[PDB]
Amino acid sequence: MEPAKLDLPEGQLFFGFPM
Amino acid sequence: SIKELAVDEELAAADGLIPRQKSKLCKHGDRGMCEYCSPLPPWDKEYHEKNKIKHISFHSYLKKLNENANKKENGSSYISPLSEPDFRINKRCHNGHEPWPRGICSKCQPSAITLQQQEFRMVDHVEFQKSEIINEFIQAWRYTGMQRFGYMYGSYSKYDNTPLGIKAVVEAIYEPPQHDEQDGLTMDVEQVKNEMLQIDRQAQEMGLSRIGLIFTDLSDAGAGDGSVFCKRHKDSFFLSSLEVIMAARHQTRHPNVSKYSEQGFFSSKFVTCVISGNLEGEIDISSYQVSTEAEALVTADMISGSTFPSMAYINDTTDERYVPEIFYMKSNEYGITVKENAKPAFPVDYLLVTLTHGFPNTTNSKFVSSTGFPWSNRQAMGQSQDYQELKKYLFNVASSGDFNLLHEKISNFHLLLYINSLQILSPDEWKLLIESAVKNEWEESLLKLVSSAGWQTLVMILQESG
Ligand SMILES: [Zn+2]
Ligand SMILES: [Zn+2]
């Protein structure tokens, strides 16, 4: 379907998205 | 000063023509030439498709724009062929109304945005001078199981495997202070900006620019192989929307100077590399930039990350932000596009351009050694820069008279930064040290260095430590 907003602050990196 | 880079001046002076063979279908004689067999321009689309080149180079693109401009009837006013896109509403427009959000007019109101895959790329290729540079960066992850972020230093030069190409040539990686985790990492933006300002200044004295960023997304596949998961591929994502936004911010902070742009700059040569598993479960590198449309979206604060990594979320209109209709040219498997609504979220790969990467073969590498002295900000890996470490690294060599070994030791990016941080050497002596580390003819500089007061003082300080 469609995603929600994931607005992380500058300088925060995230990779834990489900495969 | 605000002059163009040497590589840009050089490529502007090249014509980039691609000769062709005469054809069976040509209508002229046994000799001669026509539009069907004449040399191709450097931007030729079919040439690039034929040789599997995904984007034309920046200078091919600029020459293409110039040729189209030269088709105007003469006398007409000159227009710069390049312009950085700007999607921001003018919040100070008083053209028969009060400014946003209290009024709007055709002069201040952003019109509908249409996104499409960018046909050119500012940089075509990323060349790492030594595999040791990348492998030591990756070792942060190997040791900790935590991800890692770094800034790349080097320069730009010509790349001959595409018409009028440019490569970023990476000489070293500097890792800023960061809190690393298994599935991400966090930096204090102010702290990092302040630190990198100082590293930029020192790296410039070595003839280096900050030319990109690099990060890991590595996860052991659980097979004892040392193999890792492939997360990034055609059926998932290549760069997440978060990473595209990060790349856009960096590109805008590192503008490419161009005299052919209305603004005196156009996009950026700053590159983004990701280290992650390939389809075979091997650790590999992928290189990217983001489009000028991405730069403008992010400058206008129009997009956010989303919970689906392949998708950017579009933000709402507020008193500070104006978001018009936004569309994108959605491609099918044949590359044919159809205009579709980009709201509320759209695939971020339309904002990506891909670069190739590689290593040179066996050598104008700036630093002889890439490893052996602890890199910055690695205390959590048990690798700290202190007197004890510097003594272990350098002391016996500095007193052996072996200038080959001394040269190998001091020709080392992180070593040089640490020594300069001690403020023992004078500016003159610091310059001698840099010359000893990066010049082709280094021995004369090193002899002067070792005889200097500041160096003898450093050596004594080391001797009397531990
Ligand atoms: Zn012909
Ligand atoms: Zn207005």
Contact B170, B212 (CB under 8 A): yes
What is the nearest CA distance from B223 to chain A, expressed in angstroms? 18
Q: How far apart, in whole angstroms, are the C-alpha atoms of residue B325 and residue B375?
A: 47
Buried b (16+ CB within 10 A) or exposed e, B17-31: eeeeeeeeeeeeeee
Residues 6+ positions from B452 with CB-CB distance below 8 Å: B425, B429, B432
What's the start-to-end Cα distance of chain A, in Å?
16
Chain B residues lying within 8 Å of A11, measured CB to CB: 186-189, 192
What token pair was written down for B131?
């595999």
> Which ligand number lies closest to the CA of residue B27?
1
Interface list for chain A against chain B, based on CB atoms closer than 8 Å: 2-17, 19
Inspect the interface and report whether the beta carbons of A6 and B305 lie closer than 8 Å: yes
What token pair was written down for B97?
């109304």
Contact B79, B66 (CB under 8 A): no
Which residue of B250, B307, B314, B340 to mutate against A (max A Cβ within 10 Å)?
B307
Interface list for chain B against chain A, based on CB atoms closer than 8 Å: 147, 149, 183-189, 192, 215, 217, 229, 231, 236, 240, 242-243, 246, 249, 304-309, 311, 313, 315, 344-345
* Positive/negative CA dihedral, B96, B98, B103, B109: positive
- Which DSSP category does A4 fall into? P
What token pair was written down for B311?
């998708």
Inspect the interface and report whether the beta carbons of A14 and B189 lie closer than 8 Å: no
Q: How far apart, in whole angstroms, are the C-alpha atoms of residue B358 and residue B391?
A: 35
For residue B135, the Cα-to-chain-centroid distance in whole angstroms is 19
Q: How many CB pairs under 8 A join A and B?
A: 71
Contact B99, B108 (CB under 8 A): yes
Q: How far apart, in whole angstroms, are the C-alpha atoms of residue B188 and residue B292?
A: 27
Using CB atoms, pick whichever of A3, A12, A15 lies closest to residue B308.
A3
Which position has the token pair 């300080």? B461
B339-to-B65, B312, B333 alpha-carbon distances in Å:
24, 17, 15
For residue B74, the Cα-to-chain-centroid distance in whole angstroms is 39
Nearest CA among B333, B266, B290 for reference residue B55: B290
Domain boundaries B114-358, CATH class: alpha beta
B242-to-B114, B167, B315 alpha-carbon distances in Å:
21, 25, 14
B365-to-B205, B271, B391 alpha-carbon distances in Å:
16, 19, 26
Q: Could you tell me the strand order of the sheet in which B179-181 lies?
A: A12-14, B184-186, B179-181
Chain A residues lying within 8 Å of B309, measured CB to CB: 17
Max Cα distance, chain A (Å) = 28
In angstroms, this model's resolution equals 1.6
B305 half-sphere exposure, CB direction, 13 A CA radius = 22
Q: What is the 3-state secondary structure (H, E, C) of chain B?
A: CCCCCHHHHHHHCCCCCECCCCCCCCCCCCCCCCCCCCCECCCCHHHHHHCCCCCEEHHHHHHHHHHHHCCCCCCCCCCCCECCCCCCCCCCCCCCCCCCCCCCCCCCCCCCEEECCCCEECCCEEEECCHHHHHHHHHHHHHHCCCCEEEEEEEEEEECCCCCEEEEEEEEEECCCCEEECCEEECCHHHHHHHHHHHHHHHHHCCCEEEEEEEEECCECCCCCCCECCCCCCCCCCCCHHHHHHHHHHHHHCEEECCCECCCEEEECCEEEEEEECCCCCEEEEEEEECHHHHHHHHCCCEECECCCCEEEECCCCCCCCCCCEEEEEECCCCCEEEEECCCEEEHHHHEEEEEEECCCCCCCCCCCCCCCCCCCCHHHCCCCCHHHHHHHHHHHHCCCCHHHHHHHHCCHHHHHHHHHCCCCCHHHHHHHHHHHHCCCCHHHHHHHHHCHHHHHHHHHHHCCC
- Which DSSP category does A17 fall into? -
What token pair was written down for B220?
């052991």
What is the nearest CA distance from A13 to chain B, expressed in angstroms? 5
Q: How far apart, in whole angstroms, are the C-alpha atoms of residue B312 and residue B247?
A: 14
Which residue of B151, B178, B187 to mutate against A (max A Cβ within 10 Å)?
B187
Contact B118, B244 (CB under 8 A): no
| Mode of pairing for the β-strands spanning B337-341 and B326-331 | antiparallel
Answer left, alpha or beta for residue B208, where phi above 0 means left and psi between -120 and 50 means alpha. Answer: beta
Max Cα distance, chain B (Å) = 86
Q: Residue B71 CB: number of other CB atoms within 10 A?
A: 6
What is the nearest CA distance from B229 to chain A, expressed in angstroms? 10
Chain A residues lying within 8 Å of B344, measured CB to CB: 2
User: Dihedral of the CA atoms B457, B459, B465, B466 (nearest 10)?
Assistant: 180
Residue range(s) occupied by CATH 3.40.140.10 in chain B:
114-358
| Mode of pairing for the β-strands spanning B149-159 and B125-128 | unpaired
Q: How far apart, in whole angstroms, are the C-alpha atoms of residue B244 and residue B236?
A: 15
> Which ligand number lies closest to the CA of residue B100?
2
| Mode of pairing for the β-strands spanning B283-290 and B255-257 | unpaired
B45 half-sphere exposure, CB direction, 13 A CA radius = 2
Which position has the token pair 């427009």? B93
Burial, A10: exposed, middle or buried (Cβ in 10 Å; 0-12, 13-18, 19+)? exposed
Task: List residues bridging with B214 in a β-sheet.
Answer: B150, B273
Chain A residues lying within 8 Å of B240, measured CB to CB: 14-15, 17
Inspect the interface and report whether the beta carbons of B345 and A3 lie closer than 8 Å: yes
| Mode of pairing for the β-strands spanning B345-347 and B326-331 | unpaired
